[PDB]
Specification:
GO terms for molecular function: arylsulfatase activity; metal ion binding; N-acetylgalactosamine-4-sulfatase activity. The protein has helices at about 30-35, 50-60, 65, 90-95, 170-185, 220-245, 280-285, 310-320, 335-340, 435-450, and strands at about 5-10, 40, 45, 100-105, 125, 140-145, 150-155, 155, 160, 190-195, 250-260, 290, 300-305, 305-310, 350-355, 370-375, 380-385, 415-420. By secondary structure, the protein is an alpha/beta fold. It has two domains: about 1-345 and about 450-475, Alkaline Phosphatase, subunit A (3-Layer(aba) Sandwich); about 350-450, Arylsulfatase, C-terminal domain (2-Layer Sandwich). The termini are far apart. The structure holds a molecule of 2 linked components (NAG-NAG) (2 copies), calcium ion and chloride ion (CL). Chloride ion (CL) binds near residues 48 and 280.
Amino acid sequence: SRPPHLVFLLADDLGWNDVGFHGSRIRTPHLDALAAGGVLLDNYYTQPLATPSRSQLLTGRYQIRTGLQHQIIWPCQPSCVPLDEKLLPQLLKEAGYTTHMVGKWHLGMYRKECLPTRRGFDTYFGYLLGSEDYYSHERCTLIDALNVTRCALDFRDGEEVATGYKNMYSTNIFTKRAIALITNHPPEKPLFLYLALQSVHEPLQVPEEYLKPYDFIQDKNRHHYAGMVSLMDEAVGNVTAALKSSGLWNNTVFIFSTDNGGQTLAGGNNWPLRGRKWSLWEGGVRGVGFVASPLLKQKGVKNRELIHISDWLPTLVKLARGHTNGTKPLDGFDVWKTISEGSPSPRIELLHNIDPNFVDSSPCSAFNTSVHAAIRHGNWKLLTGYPGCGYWFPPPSQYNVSEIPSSDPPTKTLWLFDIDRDPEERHDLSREYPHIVTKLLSRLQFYHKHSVPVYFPAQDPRCDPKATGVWGPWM
Ligand SMILES: *[C@@H]1O[C@H](CO)[C@@H](O[C@@H]2O[C@H](CO)[C@@H](O)[C@H](O)[C@H]2NC(C)=O)[C@H](O)[C@H]1NC(C)=O
Ligand SMILES: *[C@@H]1O[C@H](CO)[C@@H](O[C@@H]2O[C@H](CO)[C@@H](O)[C@H](O)[C@H]2NC(C)=O)[C@H](O)[C@H]1NC(C)=O
Ligand SMILES: [Ca+2]
Ligand SMILES: [Cl-]
């Protein structure tokens, strides 16, 4: 046999209750089918934000190793994933694969060296920043030092400015590109396609026809969001259909995953899980994910083994019969036997994150419990500091309340949950199991001892895109 084609489709801001297979009122026919015929990842985790998840996805290493613990990489920040990190596509490339990427990058772009084309991907088409207009592909940000809001194009074909795509919805553009890559792929060479869609991140834009099926949803945001998810579902359908028509499917491993929990402020939903995007509650880190592939030993099963987004690197590299030589110490594991055969996971522990300067920007013992952090070990999860907005946000069309609060007093800074038996984080057990709290605090301090300093530089006004009307490198 030849190494399988590895296709990774990463959705943006897809919430736990935003797929039909989780009881969502949003219709996701294709995702449901693909999940039903494959392996549903029920104990799978990502990070609570964009840059965090994507950096861990491509480096297979925690943010405490890369200095990306705090928030994300904003447009004018002179920062990227450290240049000494070896990315997944580089390793797959050395395994004899043809690497392609389509979509959102968000891993740095202030220097040419930070670009996907200079980090492992043979070809690239998409946008560099974290968000933009679906149709114009433009992004506006406030350049502090100048006190002006600059709007500029952020679209690329290779390293060139991708002009002439105005008034064209990004998902259709990206799907068409991916399908062209699938159709025109020269057989005998393994394919690696990383499809990082804009869907379903805000702005809440969708072609008007996807709105009618959801007239029952009164909430404006969820109404528009539902249509966005449905369109994305259709796009996912086209991609898989193409892998089949092209005859690549029989030796393809298709992985679908969200990059973080839904943002209720932007129509997303995580019910019945607690929290949302930006927080370390389950609603922000436990994500929608599944593997669809004829290579799976067991199909049509819900896998409850502990997996994290950082596990994909060593997993795809092994599937690619390659080697992880060249990378710095990895924080993930090869979980293919776990996903395919359902065997005990190699991972029993997961550090969610440690951020000393965490702030909830969105509208809502050896270890210092005032520091925002969370760790999962076995069935237990410990959260310290301010985890983020801790309300449960029920689905709008089913509940006449926007949020449900907990009984936590304002001064609370420690939580212990048995996630296995209490996935909705309803009952704190910290006082009931003091020794487990102590154990996890020691682990938190262990990780803290092996962390690099947080690198969150101030804006560099020289990011100003006015001269060329396009966001891009400046250093
Ligand atoms: C998914 O594939 C469908 C079918 O190929 C795409 O819809 C077609 O788009 C063309 C281009 O304007 C139209 O002329 C056809 O009438 C449409 N075909 C069908 C069968 O409806 C769709 O755009 C693809 N992409 C996404 C993101 O859904
Ligand atoms: C425990 O953690 C908190 C928050 O991480 C620390 O308090 C902050 O310390 C920084 C460090 O220079 C200040 O700039 C912040 O303004 C402080 N407050 C907050 C809310 O972040 C605290 O000092 C840590 N150490 C101890 C010994 O408690
Ligand atoms: Ca995101
Ligand atoms: Cl975090």
